[PDB]
Amino acid sequence: TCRYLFGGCKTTADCCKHLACRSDGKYCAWDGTF
């Protein structure tokens, strides 16, 4: 269970396997890909 880009998050572990909860607005956003 996770969220996607701009997903209201409080931590990086709160997003999916690609997003990154950035502290700049507590939002999950992925960066590039693997």
Curated annotation (Swiss-Prot):
Compartments reported by the entry: Secreted
Annotated consequence of substituting residue 17 to A: No change in interaction with Kv2.1
Result for mutant: residue 13 to S: No change in interaction with Kv2.1 channels
Phenotype when changing residue 11 to A: No change in interaction with Kv2.1 channels
Tissue: Expressed by the venom gland.
Cystine bridges: 2-16, 9-21, 15-28
Site (May be involved in interaction with voltage sensor) residue list: 3, 5-6, 22
GO cellular component: extracellular space
Annotated phenotype, changing residue 32 to A: No change in interaction with Kv2.1 channels
Keywords: Disulfide bond, Ion channel impairing toxin, Knottin, Neurotoxin, Potassium channel impairing toxin, Secreted, Toxin, Voltage-gated potassium channel impairing toxin
Residue ranges, annotated region (Involved in active face): 4-6
SUPFAM superfamilies linked to this entry: omega toxin-like
UniProt-reported outcome of changing residue 6 to A: Exhibits <300-fold weaker interaction with Kv2.1 channels
Outcome reported for the amino acid change (mutating residue 25 to A): No change in interaction with Kv2.1 channels
GO function terms (MF aspect): ion channel inhibitor activity; potassium channel regulator activity; toxin activity
Record text about domains: The presence of a 'disulfide through disulfide knot' structurally defines this protein as a knottin.
Function recorded in the entry: Reversibly inhibits potassium currents in oocytes expressing Kv2.1/KCNB1 channels (Kd=2.7 uM). Acts by shifting activation of the channel to more depolarized voltages. The toxin may bind to the S3b-S4 helices of the voltage sensor paddle. One, two, three or four toxin molecules may bind the Kv2.1/KCNB1 channel. It shows low to moderate affinity for lipid bilayers. It partitions into the bilayer membrane, where it stabilizes at the water/membrane interface.
Protein name per Swiss-Prot or TrEMBL: Kappa-theraphotoxin-Scg1a
Origin species: Stromatopelma calceatum griseipes (Feather leg baboon tarantula)
